[PDB]
Amino acid sequence: LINSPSSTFPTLTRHTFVVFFRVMMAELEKTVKKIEPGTAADSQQIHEEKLLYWNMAVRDFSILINLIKVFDSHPVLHVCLKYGRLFVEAFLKQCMPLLDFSFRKHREDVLSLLETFQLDTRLLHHLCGHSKIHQDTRLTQHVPLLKKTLELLVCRVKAMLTLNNCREAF
């Protein structure tokens, strides 16, 4: 966007950014779904490296999703609406058990990871807003399960704090 009105990794024109964006978000979502949550018997080092692996995927997800605002079009919005909910569901299925194990020991890592994820959850709530406001049917049909995945995330944070005996702390 800044240099070429064609990049520093060519075959990256405004045409080809759709294809680059789609594969990057798909392969981030595929990287995150390969991560497994451990057991209490597993060492604290493997928990810490898994939490670093997770936070890396969530910051990559935020850096990719923040390219919604500057590239609002048909296929770019369809890509991140889809891989939005499909990365958040990957974050719910295979992180949240590891955060429930390692919360009373590694508390601020867990809360930081969830509140890192909430700052892009809010970008997807604004994106759900955008897909409804411009009554764009192609955008509005990935909304019900994008919103429902983020509502599962608020109630699953409540479940995390219930299971770690801070139930009034949500």
From Swiss-Prot:
Cysteines paired by S-S bonds: none
Modified residues (Phosphoserine): 43
Consequence of substituting residue 22 to H: In FANCD2; no effect on ubiquitination
UniProt subcellular location: Nucleus
Expression across tissues: Highly expressed in germinal center cells of the spleen, tonsil, and reactive lymph nodes, and in the proliferating basal layer of squamous epithelium of tonsil, esophagus, oropharynx, larynx and cervix. Expressed in cytotrophoblastic cells of the placenta and exocrine cells of the pancreas (at protein level). Highly expressed in testis, where expression is restricted to maturing spermatocytes.
Post-translational modification: Deubiquitinated by USP1 as cells enter G2/M, or once DNA repair is completed. Monoubiquitination requires the joint intervention of the FANC core complex, including FANCA, FANCB, FANCC, FANCE, FANCF, FANCG, and FANCM, and proteins involved in cell cycle checkpoints and DNA repair, including RPA1, ATR, CHEK1 and BRCA1, and is mediated by FANCL/PHF9. Monoubiquitination prevents DNA release from the FANCI-FANCD2 complex. Phosphorylated in response to various genotoxic stresses by ATM and/or ATR. In contrast, phosphorylation by ATR on other sites may be required for ubiquitination and foci formation.
Subunit structure: Homodimer; cannot be ubiquitinated and does not bind DNA. Part of a FANCI-FANCD2 heterodimeric complex that binds and scans dsDNA for DNA damage. Interacts directly with FANCE and FANCI. Interacts with USP1 and MEN1. The ubiquitinated form specifically interacts with BRCA1 and BLM. Both the nonubiquitinated and the monoubiquitinated forms interact with BRCA2; this interaction is mediated by phosphorylated FANCG and the complex also includes XCCR3. The ubiquitinated form specifically interacts with MTMR15/FAN1 (via UBZ-type zinc finger), leading to recruit MTMR15/FAN1 to sites of DNA damage.
Disease implication from the record: Fanconi anemia complementation group D2: A disorder affecting all bone marrow elements and resulting in anemia, leukopenia and thrombopenia. It is associated with cardiac, renal and limb malformations, dermal pigmentary changes, and a predisposition to the development of malignancies. At the cellular level it is associated with hypersensitivity to DNA-damaging agents, chromosomal instability (increased chromosome breakage) and defective DNA repair.
Domains: entry comment: The C-terminal 24 residues of isoform 2 are required for its function.
Family that this chain belongs to: Belongs to the Fanconi anemia protein FANCD2 family.
Function: Required for maintenance of chromosomal stability. Promotes accurate and efficient pairing of homologs during meiosis. Involved in the repair of DNA double-strand breaks, both by homologous recombination and single-strand annealing. The FANCI-FANCD2 complex binds and scans double-stranded DNA (dsDNA) for DNA damage; this complex stalls at DNA junctions between double-stranded DNA and single-stranded DNA. May participate in S phase and G2 phase checkpoint activation upon DNA damage.
Protein name per the record: Fanconi anemia group D2 protein
Organism: Homo sapiens (Human)
Gene that encodes the chain: FANCD2
